[PDB]
Amino acid sequence: GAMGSMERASLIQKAKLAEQAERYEDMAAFMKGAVEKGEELSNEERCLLSVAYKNVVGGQRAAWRVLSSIEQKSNEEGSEEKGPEVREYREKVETELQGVCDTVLGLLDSHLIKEAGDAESRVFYLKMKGDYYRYLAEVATGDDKKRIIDSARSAYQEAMDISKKEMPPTNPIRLGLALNFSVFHYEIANSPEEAISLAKTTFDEAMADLHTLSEDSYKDSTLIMQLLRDNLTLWT
């Protein structure tokens, strides 16, 4: 590990600097090094890990979609044959994306999830596991596609079960988990009705619990509620 010689606290400090500089690949590398120190992560450190990899993989996904669209058009009737290059380059980006997903899933399995006992940590990591299997599912085409989809589903479902027992309906992690699992249903599992039902029930149950919150917590929860509403508007 190239970060093995750097202090944990220095890695966290540099992750924060990398975020300020919009250097998300560096941010992710620093946070990988911090995880590999073997200690549990704090709430803020979990956010830094998630932000770093979300930005890295988000850029890869956007690029993959551009290239996949070009590849699809290149294969339509009437298109001029232009050789293997579009497929090759889409595959290059895809392999890099899969590598990042494998890295994140590897950190979660070795050994973040097994040491995560509080709901705020365990739900967060299980949500991440669902997210990175979902990104693998977005590009998957082989014998293991159904198992990749089921791995995402299983991680999200365990997170949901814990979140419903241990967190209030307005907890932002619970809300973000539901938002993302709803997207999984809609985009990955071909289950738009489940996606819509989950988003609606999540929104309504959060609405009913807002009265318990401080002004700052209300702002946090309503922000994620608005994303649920945005998706519902897209889908209905």
Binding site: G176, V183, Y186, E187, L227, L234
Partner: peptide, 6 residues
């Protein structure tokens, strides 16, 4: 549209 996730 591409849906929101966090």
């Amino acid at each position: 549209g591409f849906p929101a996730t966090v």
